[PDB]
Structure 1
């Protein structure tokens, strides 16, 4: 609908929250596929441009850091191969198909307890009460920590992210260092405990992981854990809430899923495409190149706009329709290539198990009202801030009795 070129700052969180992004993306894909925003920041907005960049890390490097407004960090997403590959193989010990599928019972049980807390009410905030608690509880359990310790880790990772985005004065630098120290010392205390007396938790697995004769240091484990805390929490939340929102807005598709649970995996893929919780990841050019009509220079960052790519008309045909039967559905919500989301199968499992139970226990779930759901103004990961819903009450399972 945009008749004029978007005049936007792609580092401004409100761009991703005010609802104007998809029509801005439409203009970019049609007119200026590798777009430069009002500060000259380049962005790959078509599916082909995103995929080309992903397939060519030699040219589009991750070592400059994957944010535009934070320094590079010592975890795997800010590495190139071969370093990245080694680190990923080490951490992958925690995410084998065996270990993910072993979480089916615990995640299912977790989902039942969350729904138990709301089922008698006839209403809840789908974000606050269902979508937000689940991913963090799953990560907490995976790490083998107590709920109280989970919550400390959550607060620390929140403060670290905040600090990393702005530590200009002398004091924010120290608060940032204090927070890093607090988080590092807590996590290393846990690591030290598992080094002596191992469990089956993710800390123990990372401690024991060995690849090409190398093992992870305590600090490496601390930072890969931090990446998992950040990367696996709000992302999963936003696909759950935003994906469910679209199911609630398309009653025929909601009904189809209620009638046939085997349709759920296809539905989850469309929930992923539509929500695209990770709005962008940055790459740094290692050479000058002319890329989809734009002159890029060595050393500049470019944003890979995953939501923009996921609504590419040349690829999806009818991307502006939400359809649980979309097939094929080669969305890039999880990225593509060597950095393809390590947690993708765990995320898909959380999404499937929760939505299964929501369909079964809240079968007449509806939005309280059809107004658009408010979105988080963040330039990295974003989705619904709240989502009031209503449903016929039902009795809690209380499975531990």
Structure 2
């Protein structure tokens, strides 16, 4: 009943378990909430949707993060400039192109589960949830298998440095990582200008914007956007979502018995986990918006998890239900910047989860104590997730490789 006293840039807010109740207060008492530093946040589903549908008033050019300026990639652009960029990568993400990866992504899933299935235990995050989407986006970007871990670690070091509570060492680590990734990209630019390939990094390297080659800086940021979108998101729905299924074993059981229930489960896994906690918009004019006066140039945080637990929309949002139908979550955002990879992400979730259900049917949490969350203010989900299961046979290994 007391107003939350919070810093929405503090990663701890998103990790310590108190967000859900804080959101509830906001949605009921101050839909457009200003935190203790005065940072405005849209907390109701309707307020998020209203902001999303009016990009003219709620611009993306100011920078998607609350404490950083606009950067040279598509998510920090408004149309038509934004669309110019989407058209450069869209062909790689058509539904047909995504569905043609079923066999490939399936083998990655089977490979990872092969690695642990005979053990009777693994960490669901480290061994399953994190590596699969990394490999998938890596494959699209031409990344070699032995370099996946390097890029994944870089990605982790960038998004974990996103918090007002981290020390100068973490910030330095963030800068050094970005410089390392920059040098990586410069090598790729030189190589793919001379020897273009069919992968997405090569396509971006040789792409054109407004009559000229995409700039070096823009190539760095566009490729990095795709990499992080790929490897710091789906992982949290896989881990956090599977956790909810294991904690609602009736629902786990229904899924093990009927895979036709999996698509509905995936949407609830998405709604619940809401990997992207927020995205910023920049007001282009003074306005009053759902009870709060906003000023031009100020940013507002679109609070997607808060929106995804809006009682007025979902009825019973605090119940995890794989039978939730319809399920109009905004885990992928809405409108202009609606997630490029959302179909890829849904496929990853489907192909991996169906294999887990199938090959590890008696999976369960190793302990029932809290699954720790990453204290970061942007993307966040489970840090680790010990699980146990009856050992089972590999599907690739022992069956002719």
- C-alpha distance 160-132 of structure 1, shift in aligned 2 (>3 A): closer
- C-alpha distance 375-166 of structure 1, shift in aligned 2 (>3 A): closer
- C-alpha distance 211-101 of structure 1, shift in aligned 2 (>3 A): farther
Corresponding residue of 2:282: 284
The residue matched to 2:171 in structure 1 has which SS?
helix
Answer yes or no: is the 8 Å Cα contact 2:11–2:162 preserved in 1. Answer: no
Q: TM-score, normalised by structure 2?
A: 0.92
More displaced 10-residue stretch of structure 1: 304-313 or 217-226:
217-226
- C-alpha distance 133-46 of structure 1, shift in aligned 2 (>3 A): same
- C-alpha distance 104-159 of structure 1, shift in aligned 2 (>3 A): same
Answer yes or no: is the 8 Å Cα contact 2:152–2:231 preserved in 1. Answer: no
Task: Pick the aligned partner of 1:176 from 174, 177, 189.
Answer: 174
Q: TM-score, normalised by structure 1?
A: 0.92
* Aligned mates of 1:193, 1:51 — CA distance in 2: 43
More displaced 10-residue stretch of structure 1: 158-167 or 111-120:
158-167
Q: How many Å apart are 1:86 and its aligned residue?
A: 0.9
What's the CA shift string for 1:284-319, capped at 9, x where partnerless? 111111100011111111111000000000000111
More displaced 10-residue stretch of structure 1: 250-259 or 54-63:
250-259
Q: How many Å apart are 1:135 and its aligned residue?
A: 1.4
The residue matched to 1:270 in structure 2 has which SS?
helix
- C-alpha distance 108-125 of structure 1, shift in aligned 2 (>3 A): same
Q: Is 1:56 aligned to 2:54, yes or no?
A: yes
* Aligned mates of 2:76, 2:273 — CA distance in 1: 24
Answer yes or no: is the 8 Å Cα contact 1:276–1:307 preserved in 2. Answer: yes
- C-alpha distance 326-176 of structure 1, shift in aligned 2 (>3 A): closer
Answer yes or no: is the 8 Å Cα contact 1:278–1:382 preserved in 2. Answer: yes
Answer yes or no: is the 8 Å Cα contact 2:63–2:71 preserved in 1. Answer: yes
More displaced 10-residue stretch of structure 1: 25-34 or 366-375:
366-375
More displaced 10-residue stretch of structure 1: 88-97 or 15-24:
88-97
* Aligned mates of 1:336, 1:172 — CA distance in 2: 32
Aligned length, in residue pairs: 399
Indicate the RMSD between aligned Cα atoms, in angstroms. Answer: 2.6
Answer yes or no: is the 8 Å Cα contact 1:42–1:301 preserved in 2. Answer: yes
More displaced 10-residue stretch of structure 1: 362-371 or 55-64:
362-371
- C-alpha distance 36-259 of structure 1, shift in aligned 2 (>3 A): same
The residue matched to 2:393 in structure 1 has which SS?
coil
Answer yes or no: is the 8 Å Cα contact 1:8–1:37 preserved in 2. Answer: yes
Runs of 5+ unmatched residues, structure 2: none
- C-alpha distance 72-397 of structure 1, shift in aligned 2 (>3 A): same
The residue matched to 2:89 in structure 1 has which SS?
helix
Answer yes or no: is the 8 Å Cα contact 2:10–2:163 preserved in 1. Answer: no
Q: How many Å apart are 1:204 and its aligned residue?
A: 3.3
Runs of 5+ unmatched residues, structure 1: none
Answer yes or no: is the 8 Å Cα contact 2:163–2:375 preserved in 1. Answer: no
Q: How many Å apart are 1:345 and its aligned residue?
A: 0.8
